[PDB]
């Protein structure tokens, strides 16, 4: 299907306690493959997936160089932002940036993006046309005017449509064994009496990849998006994912409820039934 490459950066000022913390992480789909942390000891972009270990020295030198220049732009950006908002220079502030590209099934450019946040709120974003910006407030308008004059969208657009996609593809070929895999979920159901007239029924999805999944409960075939409890999908820590959906049911009516599981790695969607 479609695939993504995404870098996320977080930069936090630390007045009175050291230099700004910078953290950078790259992903392909739901798999992390690189990172940089200002506080770590390597001071290098570091691999976190095996296929990226293939890459040679030129590559790691280059990614390290670039991530340090990102760090430095952000270090300056914290100073400017505090000036734009007339903020006392005695407070911890947070900048966030995400950019990346998506490709469709045919591995050709679908979409690009570049978002920026200050203190947890939208500041500026490139719009889907890769040509203009949305600025959330008057400070961001100042950045927008500047970036318009300096023809920044254009440089960014050439990356999103060119380099980004060309390396996404490269990564997908090189890391084919994992990135192009699906791990179908392992599934099962638990029963838990809570009282003489209720039981909690829980649906469990374990060891799946990618993260995208839908667990829904049906009574007599009719959807119950009303009274299910769903947990946010969570990481297993081994590269796979987990999720459950629970439903509290009147006693004696278990055989009427069924769990359905939609995941990319399943031949067809699963109905799990309460059959004694």
């Amino acid at each position: 299907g479609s695939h993504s490459m995404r870098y996320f950066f977080t930069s936090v000022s630390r007045p009175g306690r050291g230099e700004p913390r910078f953290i950078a992480v790259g992903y392909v789909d739901d798999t992390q493959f690189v990172r940089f942390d200002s506080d770590a000891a390597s001071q290098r972009m570091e691999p976190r997936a095996p296929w990226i270990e293939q890459e040679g020295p030129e590559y790691w030198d280059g990614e390290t160089r670039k991530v340090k220049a990102h760090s430095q732009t952000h270090r300056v950006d914290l100073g400017t932002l505090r000036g734009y908002y007339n903020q006392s220079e005695a407070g911890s502030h947070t900048v966030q940036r995400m950019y990346g590209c998506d490709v469709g099934s045919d591995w050709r450019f679908l979409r690009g993006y570049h978002q920026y946040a200050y203190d947890g709120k939208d500041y500026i974003a490139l719009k889907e046309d890769l040509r203009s910006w949305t600025a959330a407030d008057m400070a961001a308008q100042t950045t927008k005017h500047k970036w318009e004059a300096a023809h920044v969208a254009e440089q960014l657009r050439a990356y999103l449509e060119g380099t980004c996609v060309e390396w996404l593809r490269r990564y997908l070929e090189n890391g084919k064994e994992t990135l192009q895999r699906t791990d179908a979920p392992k599934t099962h159901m638990t029963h838990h009496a809570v009282s003489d007239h209720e039981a909690t029924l829980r649906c469990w999805a374990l060891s799946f990849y990618p993260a995208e999944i839908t667990l829904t409960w049906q009574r007599d075939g009719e959807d119950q998006t009303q009274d299910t409890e769903l947990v946010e999908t969570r990481p297993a820590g081994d590269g796979t994912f987990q999720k459950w959906a629970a439903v509290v049911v009147p006693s004696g009516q278990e055989q009427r409820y069924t769990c359905h599981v939609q995941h990319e790695g399943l031949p067809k969607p699963l109905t799990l039934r309460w059959e004694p």
Binding site: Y7, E63, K66, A69, H70, T80, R97, A150
Partner: peptide
């Protein structure tokens, strides 16, 4: 593969 450079806000 990162951007070769980012521009100041």
């Amino acid at each position: 593969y990162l951007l070769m450079w980012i521009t100041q806000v």
